[PDB]
Design an enzyme around this catalytic site. Structure first.
Site: not given
Length: 279
Positions: A161, A224
């Site tokens: 991220n 995720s």
């Protein structure tokens, strides 16, 4: 199958476009593959898991999931209401603390508890592992990931991220695995999502509604969150005959939604996880 007014994630992977609010799939539905959620653990007592969730392993004081993330993602794999593969077992390794963290000593040991433990379980259909985790680049953690795949456990890693080339992040960087990136619901690679050569498919990472600690069900964004969809689908598919543990990634890619995301950099694949269930 045909669950309606579904999460956006599930409906999307059943659809060649965004803008559908119903999830479609085979009656098989994960029955007999197993999936290893490697994260903060499974709240297996969740009404959503119907007994399919359990804690096979934990490197900390308790099997107990006290973050939610391990549970959240676990749901996205094999929850009944929120999950991609709604008849698959869910084998929790708890490699990560409730601080929201861990060591590669544990991480790697988690990769490698599974490379064996798969044996102890029964998955005549195949096994999937979800690397619900990632850090900077490190060449052990990547080796581990490989070893695990090398050992016939379909591996799915979040690209990360950090809004960067994934190659500076592991386990995502390991060539052999399926590295997943996030898309927002309007076919846009999500803002946080990492990118580059390595990434294989995209998934729903964004606004993703799924299970949570204490009976609840919330919605978080992240690459995720992307992965359990992909592991979910992997497990959904490997269950169907359509691929083997090795061939999952190369299938999922061959079967994806081609040129069906935007905000995709140069190099970076433009493909999106499609389940291919002509209903």
């Amino acid at each position: 199958a045909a669950q309606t007014n579904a999460p956006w994630g599930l409906a999307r992977i059943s659809s060649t476009s965004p803008g559908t609010s119903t999830y479609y799939y085979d009656e098989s539905a994960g029955q007999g593959s197993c999936v290893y959620v490697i994260d903060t653990g499974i709240e297996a007592s969740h009404p959503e898991f119907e007994g399919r969730a359990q804690m096979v392993k934990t490197y900390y004081y308790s099997s107990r999931d006290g973050n939610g993330h391990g549970t959240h993602c676990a749901g996205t794999v094999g929850s009944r209401t929120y999950g991609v593969a709604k008849k698959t077992q869910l084998f929790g390794v708890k490699v990560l603390d409730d601080n929201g963290s861990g060591q590669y000593s544990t991480i790697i040991a988690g990769m490698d508890f599974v490379a064996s433990d798969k044996n102890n379980r029964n998955c005549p259909k195949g096994v999937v592992a979800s690397l619900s985790l990632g850090g900077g680049y490190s060449s052990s953690v990547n080796s581990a990931a490989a070893r695990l795949q090398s050992s016939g456990v379909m591996v799915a890693v979040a690209a990360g991220n950090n809004n960067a080339d994934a190659r500076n992040y592991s386990p995502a960087s390991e060539p052999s695995v399926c590295t997943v990136g996030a898309s927002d619901r309007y076919d846009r690679r999500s803002s946080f999502s990492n990118y580059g050569s390595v990434l294989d498919i995209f998934g729903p990472g964004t606004s993703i509604l799924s299970t949570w600690i204490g009976g609840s069900t919330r919605s978080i964004s992240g690459t995720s969150m992307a992965t359990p969809h992909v592991a979910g689908l992997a497990a959904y598919l490997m269950t169907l005959g359509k691929t083997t543990a090795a061939s999952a990634c190369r299938y999922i890619a061959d079967t994806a939604n081609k040129g069906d995301l935007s905000n995709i950099p140069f190099g970076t694949v433009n493909l999106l996880a499609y389940n291919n269930y002509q209903a």
